[PDB]
Design a protein around this ligand. Structure first.
Ligand SMILES: Cc1nc2c(=O)[nH]c(=O)nc-2n(C[C@H](O)[C@H](O)[C@H](O)CO)c1C
Length: 180
């Protein structure tokens, strides 16, 4: 179990397209890089993945099992991914605890920045509640409202800074974890 609190951003450095599989090499920030090793299972954009290789600051993952239910297949070199390593000495399982099991891909309907808030409206596709949390790209937060097929999450603006939520646009695909 993870908290859905993103600890840093990685930047995709390389992608190997073999694609019912892809290998992503992601540049990690020093503090995260030094806590991981081959075999580390951690969350990348909310998705549980295993470190295959580390060379200097580039941490590699093979996306295979996850390839059909996540955004990785369509990511590009330079893109920013959310990173979270499991709690070191345990945690109290809330609430919005994440498993890293991504239920599927959804799409940003609308984004508005106003009043110290990042308001994010996500359209949930047919084949994929409002008192629950939801994980989006590994960010766990309470749902604000649901209207039709669209879920409204009202994030504090600081999450714009510390996660890739602040790069999202109308039409951006995201990894959704429902809980549960
Ligand atoms: C531990 C783990 N490692 C990987 C991995 O290295 N590569 C991969 O593609 N999938 C892994 N998985 C499974 C994914 O977390 C799971 O397939 C997705 O969350 C489903 O959307 C898991 C659970």
């Amino acid at each position: 179990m993870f908290k859905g609190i993103v600890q840093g951003a990685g930047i995709i450095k390389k992608i190997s397209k073999n694609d019912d599989t892809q290998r992503h090499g992601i540049t990690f920030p020093k503090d995260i890089l030094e806590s991981v090793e081959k075999g580390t299972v951690m969350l990348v954009n909310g998705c549980s993945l295993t470190v295959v290789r580390i060379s200097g600051d580039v941490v590699y993952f093979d996306i295979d099992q996850a390839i059909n239910t996540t955004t990785f297949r369509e990511l590009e070199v330079g893109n920013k991914v959310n990173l979270e390593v499991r709690p070191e000495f345990g945690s109290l399982l809330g609430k919005g605890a994440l498993t890293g099991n991504i239920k599927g891909v959804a799409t940003v309907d609308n984004i508005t920045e106003e009043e110290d808030r990042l308001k994010v409206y996500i359209k949930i596709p047919k084949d994929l509640l409002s008192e629950d949390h939801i994980g989006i790209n590994g960010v766990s937060h309470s749902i604000e409202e649901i209207s039709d097929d669209i879920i409204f999450i009202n994030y504090p603006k600081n999450l714009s800074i510390t996660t890739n939520l602040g790069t999202l646009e109308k039409g951006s695909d995201v990894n959704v974890e429902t809980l549960n």
